[PDB]
Design a protein around this ligand. Structure first.
Ligand code: HEM
Ligand code: HEM
Ligand SMILES: c1ccc2[nH]ncc2c1
Ligand SMILES: c1ccc2[nH]ncc2c1
Lengths: 137, 137
């Protein structure tokens, strides 16, 4: 279930974070404008940049903290507020996050492993609604 | 305290994992008997070896999960048994683990941060006790 999936992801966090983020960027090419240092580069070129692996892992580490503090796949309002108020998120709307979670669930369903894809779909939808309640447009 | 320290380490885990493992290898040079590929290499050279970085991060990913599952710095018996039974740990003894935790605690005390170094000292001692209970020599 959802708690075991957090343990599966954390055990190899660097690899899962890179592969899910690449799946997102390739599914939604217009989303790459939030990341100007990544434009015009193949997947393997991206993986050779120190900050691509480091920052992508740090994003997924915070995602796993929020997931583990959730109740029945509903995140804490305080965690949603942190994501709204981060200076690095100043340009964003809930649609950016909606798309990330569509790509994450698609990756889990295609992987050939027993992820609880339905719980991750709920988590993404409940995170989007919490972001709106915490003040994201 | 201990729970916040797990969050701090997870926020920059590859960097902390490599720096603590180097501290261990440099404090106890005879411990390289179990790491023959790491002989004859300076710290900067080890940090550009793919397996050194990838394996060290995976070790610390699992260490943080064992710490997070503990109660009052006492690990689960199921986590201790996993660590005894892993094929990659055949022929380790509890002294290998004792020395890794001495180095980890020394690193925290020298860091200039606010780590709860006494809780990590207790965790290392309690993990050693649990590994003995689960059958490590
Ligand atoms: C639950 C989902 C998300 C979490 C937990 C999260 C978390 C983070 C964290 C921890 C950082 C700092 C990384 C660092 O400096 O090392 C970061 C930076 C950033 N985030 Fe997010 N974020 C999420 C979703 C998104 C989405 C959907 C976008 C845009 C599509 C986005 C855009 C950015 C940008 C532009 C930065 C700064 C640039 C960079 O680090 O390279 N975030 N985020
Ligand atoms: C709580 C402490 C520890 C945890 C959580 C842990 C976990 C792990 C994990 C997850 C791996 C697999 C790495 C991979 O294949 O990518 C591994 C391999 C290994 N472990 Fe540990 N371990 C710990 C302590 C130690 C200690 C103290 C030693 C020896 C001083 C050690 C020696 C090894 C060896 C020799 C391998 C295989 C060779 C290699 O990966 O280069 N372990 N361990
Ligand atoms: C969201 C997901 C993965 C990432 N890597 N770098 C910035 C970033 C934002
Ligand atoms: C213990 C700590 C760090 C490590 N890196 N690779 C194997 C290993 C064992």
């Amino acid at each position: 279930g959802f708690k075991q999936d957090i343990a599966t992801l954390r055990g190899d966090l660097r690899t899962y974070a890179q592969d899910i983020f690449l799946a997102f960027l390739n599914k939604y090419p217009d989303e790459k404008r939030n990341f100007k240092n990544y434009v015009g580069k193949s997947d393997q070129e991206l993986k050779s940049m120190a900050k691509f692996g480091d920052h992508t892992e740090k994003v997924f580490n915070l995602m796993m903290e929020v997931a583990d503090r959730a109740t029945d796949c509903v995140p804490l309002a305080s965690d949603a507020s942190t994501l709204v108020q981060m200076k690095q998120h100043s340009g964003l709307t809930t649609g950016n996050f909606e798309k990330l979670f569509v790509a994450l669930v698609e990756y889990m369903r295609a992987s050939g492993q027993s992820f609880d894809s339905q719980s991750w779909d709920r988590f993404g939808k409940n995170l989007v609604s919490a972001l709106s309640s915490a003040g994201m447009k």
